[PDB]
Amino acid sequence: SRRARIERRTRESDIVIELDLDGTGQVAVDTGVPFYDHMLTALGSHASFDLTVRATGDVEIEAHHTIEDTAIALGTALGQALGDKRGIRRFGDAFIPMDETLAHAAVDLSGRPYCVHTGEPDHLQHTTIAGSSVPYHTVINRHVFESLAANARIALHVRVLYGRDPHHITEAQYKAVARALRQAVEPDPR
Amino acid sequence: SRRARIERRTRESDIVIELDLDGTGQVAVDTGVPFYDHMLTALGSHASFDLTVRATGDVEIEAHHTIEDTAIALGTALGQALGDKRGIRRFGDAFIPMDETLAHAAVDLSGRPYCVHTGEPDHLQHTTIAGSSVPYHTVINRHVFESLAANARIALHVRVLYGRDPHHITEAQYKAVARALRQAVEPDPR
Amino acid sequence: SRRARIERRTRESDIVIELDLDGTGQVAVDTGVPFYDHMLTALGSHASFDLTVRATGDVEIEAHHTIEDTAIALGTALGQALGDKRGIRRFGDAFIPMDETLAHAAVDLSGRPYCVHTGEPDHLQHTTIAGSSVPYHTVINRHVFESLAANARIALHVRVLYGRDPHHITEAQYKAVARALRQAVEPDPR
Amino acid sequence: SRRARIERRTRESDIVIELDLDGTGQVAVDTGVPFYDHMLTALGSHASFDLTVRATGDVEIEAHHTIEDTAIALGTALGQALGDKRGIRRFGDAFIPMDETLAHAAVDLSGRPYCVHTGEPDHLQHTTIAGSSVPYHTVINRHVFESLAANARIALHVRVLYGRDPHHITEAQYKAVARALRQAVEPDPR
Amino acid sequence: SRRARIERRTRESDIVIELDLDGTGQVAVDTGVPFYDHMLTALGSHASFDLTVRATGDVEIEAHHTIEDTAIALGTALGQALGDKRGIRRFGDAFIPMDETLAHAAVDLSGRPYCVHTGEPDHLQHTTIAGSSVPYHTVINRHVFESLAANARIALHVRVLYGRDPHHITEAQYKAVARALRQAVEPDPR
Amino acid sequence: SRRARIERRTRESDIVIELDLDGTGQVAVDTGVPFYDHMLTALGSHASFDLTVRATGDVEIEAHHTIEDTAIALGTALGQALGDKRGIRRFGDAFIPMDETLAHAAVDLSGRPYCVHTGEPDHLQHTTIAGSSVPYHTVINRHVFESLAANARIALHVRVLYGRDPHHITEAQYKAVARALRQAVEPDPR
Ligand SMILES: C[C@H](N)c1ncnn1C
Ligand SMILES: C[C@H](N)c1ncnn1C
Ligand SMILES: C[C@H](N)c1ncnn1C
Ligand SMILES: C[C@H](N)c1ncnn1C
Ligand SMILES: C[C@H](N)c1ncnn1C
Ligand SMILES: C[C@H](N)c1ncnn1C
Ligand SMILES: [Cl-]
Ligand SMILES: [Cl-]
Ligand SMILES: [Cl-]
Ligand SMILES: [Cl-]
Ligand SMILES: [Cl-]
Ligand SMILES: [Cl-]
Ligand SMILES: [Cl-]
Ligand SMILES: [Cl-]
Ligand SMILES: [Mn+2]
Ligand SMILES: [Mn+2]
Ligand SMILES: [Mn+2]
Ligand SMILES: [Mn+2]
Ligand SMILES: [Mn+2]
Ligand SMILES: [Mn+2]
Ligand SMILES: [Mn+2]
Ligand SMILES: [Mn+2]
Ligand SMILES: [Mn+2]
Ligand SMILES: [Mn+2]
Ligand SMILES: [Mn+2]
Numbered sequence A, B, C, D, E, F: 001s002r003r004a005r006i007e008r009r010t011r012e013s014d015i016v017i018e019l020d021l022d023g024t025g026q027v028a029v030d031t032g033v034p035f036y037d038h039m040l041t042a043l044g045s046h047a048s049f050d051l052t053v054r055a056t057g058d059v060e061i062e063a064h065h066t067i068e069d070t071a072i073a074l075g076t077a078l079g080q081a082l083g084d085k086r087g088i089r090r091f092g093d094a095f096i097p098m099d100e101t102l103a104h105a106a107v108d109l110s111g112r113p114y115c116v117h118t119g120e121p122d123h124l125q126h127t128t129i130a131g132s133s134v135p136y137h138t139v140i141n142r143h144v145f146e147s148l149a150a151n152a153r154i155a156l157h158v159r160v161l162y163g164r165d166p167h168h169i170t171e172a173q174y175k176a177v178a179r180a181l182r183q184a185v186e187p188d189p190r
């Protein structure tokens, strides 16, 4: 019913997305960027989407191209799956506490792309989350939210009220976006 | 069930309101102040009210008297239609993104009039929204929210978190008030 | 189903709590600290808990030991009654207007104790609410929210956006916590 | 070759656009908003487009809905007329002196919507340009540039380096956008 | 006609450059520093050079020696390929929007080395762009522009007007330099 | 075709100008003010004018009268040679790096005299460039640009973005004006 498959092939990367808005959190994400996989898994899961993301790209340069192409493809999938948007809540918002961090997201499935990203501490503009694989530059958080909003053609407002840990700050925002979208896409009984 | 017809006849104006709290967004508004009509249409629609507003007044002076008398009559209608307020959520709140603008409203159907209006940029105290008819002075936004709260006998908190466009800022607040009221008036299953 | 009886006996006090998460606001609170009774009655009632609190302690010293032991016991009861937390909303938040005051609470039933308490005016750190019985030092507000979060093993974020009256400020926060918990404990239909 | 006809019919307005990128400045604009007509005539003319804009809307509210719908439709027309964007300069920029005013615009026909609007004096956020017809609120300048960029799917950077007259400031920006687009859409001989 | 092959062999690295000023963007770059490869590919491509860069060096230390030796060799190639500079535009400049970033470069093929690098945010002095290979320290951006200007014996002015993403900021500057050089090297018909 | 001879005889000086807009940089300048000769030679040359300037005046007082009368006569020559301005680019701009200095000029051949001169360091208001002949007070730079714009009846915006050497700062501005005029006077193929 509210399903979309998107294939996005650029010079930099290859994305396949399958998205059901009316899922149960059946999520599988593989981008070659394990922190990004974790954020997109949290997003699909907390939005009660069924979501599959398979992506490969030029991670020898860094994660940016793959992260962005994935967020563009995912936005386009959200846009297509929503269709005409008849009968939905349209507006959604969620607070996510994560230990010391409090994040908020608010959505209007308006059909007009807009993203306002505020309150993220300045040190996230040069912070790296790094393990044994491809690292994740938190400066990309904004870019992901912008790409998503631009291609789904929605208003997306993401706020960090406060926080310290860059992992708590980043995950709280992805989870906020996710639960905001969940409320906004659900059928409006009136 | 939760219906009220209010007639308000002053030296300055004539107001008829018909309000059903349990509507489907069947809204008709005619005040001679077309921007106000647009805001009150957004309010009735986003609150899932059935609402009829017919108003005439001294618009040769300006919109103020008609705007205020209408907001007083509309408040009184909300107050009467709520009745004893048995079994309702009582508390409601909503975030409204509108492009660059984010507004919020929170309500307590307490039976104690109170309005706190914060965060609206200072230039809305001398901004005019003007077309081919009677103009709308955004300084009146507060007055409308105050009049509504005073006569419905509710606590109404309206916040502009941020914004630039006076039309986005004003409409976002009316829509926030509307969805806050919608959540607050709905039956509480517990 | 989601019931817990907690008995807590310290050198300073004796607490019995009985808590049903799936109640109708059947609340009885007796701590010897009548303002605290009023706050805990508001909390149980606004959370739609069935709640019984019987506490006696060393109020000849002041309310602190009894308030804290009660909040610890109540937290432990919330923790036990939630059990494995299968199938619940998990996240909850609420705005509470109270005349001039606006408070907010957000919860994550994470299993990781955390409390962030912000925005409370500085004069509540030496304010007393006093009647004909044992008085209530508002400096204890934070301590109560911290104790509750620590022993229920949840993330609890409590914000005063603004306010003036210490009674409005305190009650608004307890009511916010209550409605945040109510949303968070309810079954998630998905 | 690089032609597009767009029809956009909303609740608020009716837009017809016909756009040839490879024109000689054959421009006809009728929106019911004569200052807007003047700005869009300057844009089509200074971009050497052939452009026809016919729009009607709810100007009894004010110009906003009609201005925005027109800018959305015009953006969509630019997007469609560019097609695959094979063989073009892609990047374009122009300085426009206008008496005391200096404006600049830079474009990347990237396929990624983005608009950065800077340097416009603060008083243009509540300035009105008013004649004998529907007035023009200069706060809308940004909104127009944003709408255009979002729907043409280009990067558009518009700068006021300095200026005083709101008419000089506004027209200089529209002319800058126009000549930036003209350079960017032209065939790249290499 | 305007071709140069440069071989540069230091203790730290081995560089081979082949450069045609009058190319079609036939570019192949391999330095062992994949982000640098991406920047130098963008530069050759956006300048419509035919360009081959093969470099190996002491990347076990970090990218610096290889980046610098490559920029020195590339500058020397630009210098030799320009020859006597008879009949060329000499002056060139370009604006590059890249999402939120706006960069500018201006060139004078003067025969006097000079580089002015301004406006780059302070956090790019300790930012790393890191993937699965050798990372790129953005502090090197200036060094690259300086090395290039010193060895091509040109005036090179590179400006970041504004920006946030270090990848957008860096790539925008390389693209600006590239299009500035493209305009400056082209035959002057007068 | 686009030629003008101007003779200007005041109490203070005697000017003969011959100007072809469609020249090859055939320039001869003799004012008795050798630094001025150098600046006007750079201007005619970098604008691809054919230009002859012969001037004599009261240099025993200082260069001012001769500089100004020459700039007035030269402006009048530009005005007359442009004629009706049918079919020209009209708008032109150029960046000129000169070692540490970056200057910019933008022109609108509008038929409305206007000059905005900004960014020149304050010490150029009392700097002298002095050799073995009549010296040049850099405070006159503005006066020259103003005189030129007033009598050619064009908008001329001249910016020093930054610089240190008064000779680099002055020459960069004359060269910027020159290349801005060159782009603006050239035939517009559309
Ligand atoms: C496991 C969860 N994703 C988490 N990330 C950082 N902190 N926590 C609790
Ligand atoms: C049409 C809607 N009422 C609106 N007003 C201002 N902007 N937008 C989108
Ligand atoms: C009765 C209620 N608990 C209250 N306390 C302070 N103000 N109000 C209304
Ligand atoms: C006529 C032109 N559109 C203009 N508008 C304001 N000033 N000027 C010269
Ligand atoms: C693909 C392109 N090189 C790019 N890098 C960062 N952002 N974008 C669009
Ligand atoms: C020779 C040229 N006119 C010049 N003047 C000052 N510096 N330079 C290079
Ligand atoms: Cl989780
Ligand atoms: Cl709407
Ligand atoms: Cl109550
Ligand atoms: Cl908030
Ligand atoms: Cl014009
Ligand atoms: Cl600039
Ligand atoms: Cl590119
Ligand atoms: Cl020279
Ligand atoms: Mn990007
Ligand atoms: Mn995690
Ligand atoms: Mn009044
Ligand atoms: Mn509207
Ligand atoms: Mn204690
Ligand atoms: Mn009370
Ligand atoms: Mn709008
Ligand atoms: Mn005009
Ligand atoms: Mn070095
Ligand atoms: Mn890139
Ligand atoms: Mn003078």
Ligand SMILES: [Mn+2]
Residues within 6 Å of the ligand: F038, F167, F171
């Ligand atoms: Mn010189």
